[PDB]
């Protein structure tokens, strides 16, 4: 375990490189980039459900803010999407 | 990144959540639709099987919706619109994994049930909210072929009976049932194959049978029933024998279970108190069919503390009301029906006491429906005083465009404070002698409302122009008889593209002022339905009697009827 007891969560596993020190900690004490990597599905549904609430109930924008991505979208391709998806799926 | 973006993305189930997301960017946007199990459609003429089919296409469960809601006032003649095939003929070759299909107002078929049942094979879900075109024979193909089937509910569906004996082309290895609702059913479905249906299905939680199980089988269909949910009762009359009621008490009090009852046909007072060892527990309750008087309405209530919704006819009376008021403090929503409304003379003393009653005494009491007689704005305002967190209210009046009765006045004021209080009032529904003012109000005040409806109010354009210019979160608005007509429709046309569509039917509407919204507004599908031949046999500035204004990126439709034209 670098960089039996209760280690067989991972089923990348039941020796690791692409994690750390103070990360593994973390694990043991118990990112998601992680949580997967190692395959322990309960600390998965953990992350990705928080996660999905930084979400929940914002904005397009308020969520590219509250992250970090770039919005890619020519606005002919936005307006057409938002068109879409309040005109047919809302 | 994509496996952990997909993980993400299953928790979030919220269509406008859902649109939120595939709107951050280019990589969210595919992810998101690949993964995509719900499809909301509002408005089938919106959008079309093949453009959805793309955009979505691992959907496991689809939901749409046909005629407007003034179907149900028989104001959309049978044609209009509706057809559910080409949904069905489109999923049907993409959509393998398809596992549920909500449908209201709209067009089925035989053809179309045969088509799901034989394309579908993890079908799971189908239920018909009000729709028309298909007959028991249609079920029979449901029940012989849907290996999996959980839920299979007809809502005041409108079938062809030819026959009960549909339910036993069900097969003797079927189990899966979860929920059965046959109310709308004439046909009597054989009682040996619902029993032996009912008793192999364990894990049938929700059972709403139809007129043609007398009270006399209740009990017996309980015994193998145990564990469930909801019921709906068949008949609920009998001749009175102590063998009888107590049968069923026994039954019904085996059923630790239920929460949720109607049905109730006829029902004989006599064997309502049976329903009591229930009563208790009880969050629903719908005795809409039930023409029991007041006393026992009262006698069934007391027993109920737990109730959330309730409907009933208007024989609960302002006494019954009372008593509702102080028995039920978990009340959330109240439909009060009438029993008899072709008579403006009471038959009932269910007046306005009533529902300002239910109002101080139910904190919670948020959703409201209620046909009286009689109306004053004393009344509205104290309701809107006490329920600031209503959020659905209907009024209906009986005798149209009737006053306050004390001091004559029309109601604006008294509308007026429930939208000025209501700050999150999101329907409403509108009678008795009402102005322009009134609407003036609900544009001012009326900021959450997503759905409106209206008949026999306001003087003047004036007023649906104080409703198209103020309703930031309309969504729905239907009008009737109403003095309104081409200049607010005009005035506000790019409203109309941030609502899902505008019902106006025996209105000021002329044929003129259709033709140029339809021009102004290629994006827009602007109906007029209209049965007295060609609009143009009449001089432009005539009225016609309906017009269906919605928006859609679908274009025109294929499927009009004749007494129907878009432009
Ligand atoms: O328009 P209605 O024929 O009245 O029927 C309903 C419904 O009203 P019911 O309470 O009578 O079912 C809901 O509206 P609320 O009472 O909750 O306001 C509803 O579905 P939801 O449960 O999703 O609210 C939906 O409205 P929508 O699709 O606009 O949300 C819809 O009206 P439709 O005739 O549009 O289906
Ligand atoms: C009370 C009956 C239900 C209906 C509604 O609340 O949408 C309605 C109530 N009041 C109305 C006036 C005009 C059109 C529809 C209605």
């Not at chain 1, 600390?43 to 999905?52: E, G, K, P, R, S």
């Not at chain 2, 008087?293 to 027993?303: H, N, P």
Request: hydrophobic letters at 40%; proline letters at 5%.
């Amino acid at each position: 375990l670098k960089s039996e007891a209760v280690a067989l969560e991972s089923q990348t596993i039941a020796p690791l490189p692409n994690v750390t020190s103070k990360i593994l900690a973390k694990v043991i004490e118990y990112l998601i980039l992680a949580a997967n990597y190692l395959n322990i599905k309960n600390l998965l549904d953990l992350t990705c459900q928080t996660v999905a609430d930084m979400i929940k109930g914002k904005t397009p924008e308020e969520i590219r803010t509250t992250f970090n991505i770039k919005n890619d979208f020519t606005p002919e391709e936005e307006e057409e999407v938002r068109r879409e998806n309040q005109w047919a799926f809302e | 990144p994509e496996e952990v973006l997909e993980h993400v993305f299953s928790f979030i189930q919220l269509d406008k959540d859902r649109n939120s997301v595939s709107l951050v960017c280019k990589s969210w946007y595919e992810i998101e639709r690949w993964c995509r199990r719900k499809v909301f459609i509002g408005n089938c003429y919106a959008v079309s099987p093949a453009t959805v089919i793309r955009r979505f296409p691992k959907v496991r469960s689809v939901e749409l919706k046909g005629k407007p809601h003034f179907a149900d006032f028989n104001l959309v003649p049978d044609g209009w619109g509706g057809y559910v095939y080409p949904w069905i003929e489109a999923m049907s070759s993409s959509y393998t994994w398809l596992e549920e299909i909500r449908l209201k107002r709209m067009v089925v078929t035989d053809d179309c049930l045969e088509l799901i049942a034989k394309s579908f094979k993890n079908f799971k879900v189908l239920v018909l909210s009000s729709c028309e075109g298909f007959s028991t024979d249609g079920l029979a193909a449901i029940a012989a072929t849907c290996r999996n089937l959980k839920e299979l509910d007809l809502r005041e569906s409108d079938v062809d009976d030819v026959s009960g004996h549909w339910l036993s082309h069900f097969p003797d290895t079927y189990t899966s049932l979860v929920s059965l609702n046959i109310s709308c059913l004439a046909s009597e479905v054989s009682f040996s194959a619902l029993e032996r249906l009912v008793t192999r299905c364990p894990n049938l939680k929700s059972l709403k049978l139809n007129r043609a199980v007398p009270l006399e089988k209740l009990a017996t269909l309980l015994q193998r029933a145990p564990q469930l949910e909801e019921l709906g009762t068949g008949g609920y009359t009998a001749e009175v024998r102590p063998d009888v009621y107590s049968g069923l008490s026994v039954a019904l009090s085996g059923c630790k279970e239920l929460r949720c009852l109607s049905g109730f046909w006829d029902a004989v007072p006599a064997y309502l108190p049976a329903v009591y060892s229930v009563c208790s527990r009880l969050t629903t309750l719908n005795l809409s069919y039930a023409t029991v008087q007041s006393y026992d309405l009262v006698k069934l209530l007391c027993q109920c503390p737990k109730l959330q919704r309730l409907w009933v006819l208007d024989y609960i009376e302002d006494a019954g009301l009372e008593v509702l008021a102080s028995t039920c403090k978990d009340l959330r929503e109240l439909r009060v029906f009438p029993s008899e409304p072709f008579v403006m003379e009471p038959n009932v003393a269910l007046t306005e006491q009533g529902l300002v009653s239910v109002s101080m005494g139910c904190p919670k009491l948020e959703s409201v429906l209620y046909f009286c007689r009689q109306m004053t704005n004393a009344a509205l305002i104290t309701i809107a005083r006490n329920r600031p967190n209503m959020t659905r209210f209907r009024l209906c009046i009986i005798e149209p465009k009737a006053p306050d009765y004390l001091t004559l006045e029309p109601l604006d004021i008294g509308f007026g404070a429930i939208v000025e209080h209501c700050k999150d009032l999101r329907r409403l529904s509108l009678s008795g002698l009402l102005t322009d003012k009134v609407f003036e109000y609900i544009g001012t005040y009326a900021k959450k409302m997503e759905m409106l409806s209206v008949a026999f109010a306001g003087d003047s354009d004036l007023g649906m122009h104080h409703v198209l210019s103020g309703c930031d979160s309309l969504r729905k608005l239907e009008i009737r008889d109403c003095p309104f007509g081409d200049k607010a429709l005009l005035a506000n046309a790019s409203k109309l593209e941030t609502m899902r569509s505008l019902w106006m039917s025996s209105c000021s509407v002329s044929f003129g002022a259709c033709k140029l919204l339809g021009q102004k507004m290629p994006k827009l599908n602007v109906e007029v339905i209209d049965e007295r031949g060609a609009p143009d046999s009449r001089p432009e500035s005539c009225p016609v009697e309906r017009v269906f204004i919605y928006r859609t990126v679908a274009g025109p439709r294929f499927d009009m009827p004749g007494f129907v034209w878009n432009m």
